[PDB]
Design a binder for this molecule. Sequence first.
Ligand SMILES: *[C@@H]1O[C@H](CO)[C@@H](O)[C@H](O)[C@H]1NC(C)=O
Ligand SMILES: *[C@@H]1O[C@H](CO)[C@@H](O)[C@H](O)[C@H]1NC(C)=O
Ligand SMILES: *[C@@H]1O[C@H](CO)[C@@H](O)[C@H](O)[C@H]1NC(C)=O
Ligand SMILES: *[C@@H]1O[C@H](CO)[C@@H](O)[C@H](O)[C@H]1NC(C)=O
Ligand SMILES: *[C@@H]1O[C@H](CO)[C@@H](O)[C@H](O)[C@H]1NC(C)=O
Ligand SMILES: *[C@@H]1O[C@H](CO)[C@@H](O)[C@H](O)[C@H]1NC(C)=O
Ligand SMILES: *[C@@H]1O[C@H](CO)[C@@H](O)[C@H](O)[C@H]1NC(C)=O
Lengths: 998, 98, 49, 49, 49
Amino acid sequence: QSYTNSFTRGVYYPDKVFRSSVLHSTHDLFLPFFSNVTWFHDNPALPFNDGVYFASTEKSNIIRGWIFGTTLDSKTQSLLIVNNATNVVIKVCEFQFCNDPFLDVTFEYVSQPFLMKNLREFVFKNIDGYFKIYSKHTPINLERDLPQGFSALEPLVDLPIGINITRFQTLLALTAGAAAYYVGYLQPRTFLLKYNENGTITDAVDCALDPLSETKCTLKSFTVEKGIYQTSNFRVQPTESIVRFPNITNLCPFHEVFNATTFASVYAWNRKRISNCVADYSVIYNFAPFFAFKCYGVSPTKLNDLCFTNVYADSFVIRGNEVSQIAPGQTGNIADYNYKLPDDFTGCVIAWNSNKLDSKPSGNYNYRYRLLRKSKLKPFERDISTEIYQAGNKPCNGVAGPNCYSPLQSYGFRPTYGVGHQPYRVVVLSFELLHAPATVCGPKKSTNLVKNKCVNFNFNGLTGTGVLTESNKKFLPFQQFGRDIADTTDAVRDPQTLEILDITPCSFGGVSVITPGTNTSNQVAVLYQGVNCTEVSNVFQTRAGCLIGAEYVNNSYECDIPIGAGICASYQTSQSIIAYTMSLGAENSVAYSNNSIAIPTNFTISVTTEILPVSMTKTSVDCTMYICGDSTECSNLLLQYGSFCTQLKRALTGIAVEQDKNTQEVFAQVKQIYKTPPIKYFGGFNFSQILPDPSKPSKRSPIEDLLFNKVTKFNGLTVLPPLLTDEMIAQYTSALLAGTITSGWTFGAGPALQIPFPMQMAYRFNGIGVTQNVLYENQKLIANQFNSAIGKIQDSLSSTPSALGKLQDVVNHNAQALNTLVKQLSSKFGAISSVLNDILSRLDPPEAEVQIDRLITGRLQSLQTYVTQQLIRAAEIRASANLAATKMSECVLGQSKRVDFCGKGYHLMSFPQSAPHGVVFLHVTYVPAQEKNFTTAPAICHDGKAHFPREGVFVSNGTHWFVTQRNFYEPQIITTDNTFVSGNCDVVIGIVNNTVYD
Amino acid sequence: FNGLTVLPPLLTDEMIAQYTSALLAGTITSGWTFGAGPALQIPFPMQMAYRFNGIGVTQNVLYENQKLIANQFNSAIGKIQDSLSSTPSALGKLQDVV
Amino acid sequence: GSFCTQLKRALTGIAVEQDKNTQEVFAQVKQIYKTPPIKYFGGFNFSQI
Amino acid sequence: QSLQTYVTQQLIRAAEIRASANLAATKMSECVLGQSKRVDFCGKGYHLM
Amino acid sequence: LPFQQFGRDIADTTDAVRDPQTLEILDITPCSFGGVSVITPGTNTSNQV
Ligand SMILES: *[C@@H]1O[C@H](CO)[C@@H](O)[C@H](O)[C@H]1NC(C)=O
Ligand SMILES: *[C@@H]1O[C@H](CO)[C@@H](O)[C@H](O)[C@H]1NC(C)=O
Ligand SMILES: *[C@@H]1O[C@H](CO)[C@@H](O)[C@H](O)[C@H]1NC(C)=O
Ligand SMILES: *[C@@H]1O[C@H](CO)[C@@H](O)[C@H](O)[C@H]1NC(C)=O
Ligand SMILES: *[C@@H]1O[C@H](CO)[C@@H](O)[C@H](O)[C@H]1NC(C)=O
Ligand SMILES: *[C@@H]1O[C@H](CO)[C@@H](O)[C@H](O)[C@H]1NC(C)=O
Ligand SMILES: *[C@@H]1O[C@H](CO)[C@@H](O)[C@H](O)[C@H]1NC(C)=O
């Protein structure tokens, strides 16, 4: 018993197509990675299944070929392969195998032999009438098991034989056969194959192996970034099936049509009509064994499957040999003169002997049959008229005798009679079908009720799937079902016992795979959304669902991978993924008091980045070329639909013009083009990182170059270039920066008025509530902080790609849409093929019209979806562009007092920079720092008069009282110059006695 | 439930209430200083005086009329609850969304 | 075709957008502030808020 | 077609809610985290808080 | 590769085909197509385009 781990082996090329540096997903028979593979070493029949993976490292070549015959004998066609040193000879011809088929050494294919530490990997498959053989021969290092690595199996040969291949046998050529070959069986699987630039498969991923593999298949990438990914759906399958029809009660009078003790005669056969009853044939089959039971219309079992409105029963007694006359198309006295079945009769003829009951020794002359009639009877007719038969050409004159005989003559039945004249009871059943409601059927069956389990149910003709529980609801007596607000069945009354059973849909929910980056680890956790942990490593139940593979930790961290209602997962470090309640932030209690204030004593100049999309890719679609290509028939058919193509073209043109308007609105704020002076000294402020670099031909700033480096045909689809090139947007950005540096905010509101940069920044400090002396006294420190922040901006942008995640997203979305729009060209949409020329060539025009119509409808719906999605995205981008224009006007051409609009902090000035399809704003902000606690008083009482500060707040260091501005601790002596009286001393609450000088 | 599922929001109602409590505490204890940087202690009457200066009214108006302003604010806050309760259409936007 | 994937992506984008909406509106404060235990704010009454 | 109609309508409603959420974020930053001089942005009258 | 006959791109469109007579690799580019735009001043001004 040798069994080995298959590893990642057995991946072949699905088709003849070449692909380069692409990842392709195929649904095809394959060997699942890490699977159950049998290592073999008298020789029973191995099942071929759908396919076989045969891996032989047999250097001795005891294995010469294979026997794929389904019988291994001369009964059927046996596929026989010989792989000698000369050549491979695939033979199919009829061979008389000897008693021991072994050599000392119709349909034939001779080729170069398959054989050459060789790993002979072979894949044998048989689909759509073709037998496919794939081969691979690779050197292996010293090992007695399958090597670790990846090898692709090139196709070797195809055979058009297409016969049934159930069993395969390894051909024996010598008896102890010890051969070291692995055999595995292929399965229908979905795989993802990575082709290199050389055209070969370097690696593969099996979708249904593990959750990480499923998410790799879903994203079509071998590297999965950190996040939570919705992969599949989870449904609980029905374990059992239940059928419930009402109590079989009432029943067809079958016990009366038989066991009647008298069948009258056959000249006037008793006609019995039966309808509206429960059909049960148990008594019919339980009666005496039948001499003749022939059914002409339906099988006896399937009689119960077929429902008949009208059932006709005809009962009579005839002799033994006259039974053969009661059959369709029979000629004979009884058949033509007593009871004639139709040629296309559909019914059962049941006959059983009645000699034991209806035979009398004296002679039972009651039963009679007719032996003289004027003509043959029409089918299904009863003639009871008995007058003197007129055989003679003379008138009978109502009497009998000469040439005038009685029409009827009786059987004389006596028990001593032999078989062939004994009385036989025949009951002919006739079934009629007519176009009206039926309501007559056979024993409707029923199964035991199953509760609290996902079951299929068919309750009184109502079908469904679900979990059946007891219901508190009380139905009215005549009701059967219960239906909720959405018109879905929620309760059912059981027919057999009147019980109200509630129906609950079986558990279903999404499956999400919480993974760190594939670089960080291969461990994953799985979240079943909305599923109780009972219904599905470490199992944890959360409001989102059931989380398997992550351990709950009491401590709280900042959220990393969102899951649900306050639960986030992270890879913190056996130790693995942990789930926790997310921490909103550090708790800080501000020391509030009646007379305590906190005044900052220093500042920080902080530069932040805000990335805003401005424009999206401009696309134009040629409706005729996309839908139809070069086919004239398709164009003629499209003309009937209307002017849809014109509407789509109008919408796309509108989007394109809107994109141009967006870029103009954001960047064309200034009409003049301003140039910075050649002598670039601005009071210690270094704008080199934002100003253009003359050295490189692009004339872009270092930050702009970094942004462009980071972010950075078909079928009627065209990408129209933007009206403004990147160089023109660079010129606009340079003009805005030069105007801001040289003229402050004056260039936005009129003519540019030059002002030294320190003076401009001092006026911005006045704008944020800080005096000029703060800037002029701390000019070098402010300059150094600004320089350090601008330096750090480059590193912050470069190191973290996610900072530019907005703009890139736009690009990706556009590409994705286009790819979908092209991919749906290959979709069939219910037609024969995606290729219009193939449909036109294979099918006649009248039949091809429907296929082309389906393709046109599908492709036109695809175009409409694309245009609507583009319109929604254009609305979003227009909103972003309007926000960017407002920020350019209010943050770059001016100083804004709006909080959090221009950066985080007290806004000083904003610098624009251009990025592919967007704008990056560098906001410079004043952040207070190093705060100190002081005692404060609303007013100072001097000379019985209150005193309030003109600007600032009254503060105390503990013994002395000063007046200082809010945002910077600059204590000043309280003087009448910085105070105003405004009232007496009694009214104000919290007033402090103190001295005010003059 | 025919394949339609409702995903829970990431932030629970308790967590949003906790953000709202943080915002209110910051506004009451620190004025607008907590938005632009570290939160700085300031007595609430001083904050209202600075807000009066912002709207163009001197500090003496607040300090001299502090009880009146406090009573007016308290009465308005008291009336807000009754006004919301009386007219359901006040919350008609959110309901409509749902 | 791949209509199911497009619809699923659209709904997922909507969901993430809703979470980001709530984050943007409410998560502006970096730290969680607590009001002092003694609630006297110069006669102002914040008990209802 | 029914599902695509639902997704498109829900995307439009998501755009409307996103506009409302951006307005709410702006109002939180400008009215709650500061004093706004913008007329009628934060209530009717001269905005205090 | 010796067994491969067609070539497909990332969009599942044919980009290379092997010549059945002689084994040579032939690249297929789509035949030139584009849109046509007419730049005109107002017909009230002039008729040149
Ligand atoms: C081996 O097979 C080839 C294939 O037809 C055949 O020509 C040759 O005669 C065979 N040789 C032996 C060993 O019989
Ligand atoms: C695959 O491509 C690489 C390209 O660098 C080349 O070095 C290598 O030889 C190729 N392998 C082949 C042709 O088998
Ligand atoms: C059907 O027969 C069962 C046998 O126990 C009985 O309990 C039930 O009441 C019957 N159905 C009706 C509708 O009476
Ligand atoms: C899961 O099932 C248990 C069984 O008692 C129940 O208590 C619990 O409430 C269920 N979970 C949910 C989310 O309803
Ligand atoms: C308070 O400030 C004065 C300056 O006016 C200084 O002389 C004194 O030492 C300081 N002491 C305290 C109480 O902090
Ligand atoms: C301030 O001076 C006045 C003058 O009489 C006095 O009545 C008052 O008590 C002083 N302030 C305090 C807080 O004692
Ligand atoms: C005012 O505050 C008191 C406690 O200080 C409280 O009981 C009362 O309800 C408040 N009134 C309001 C908010 O109208």
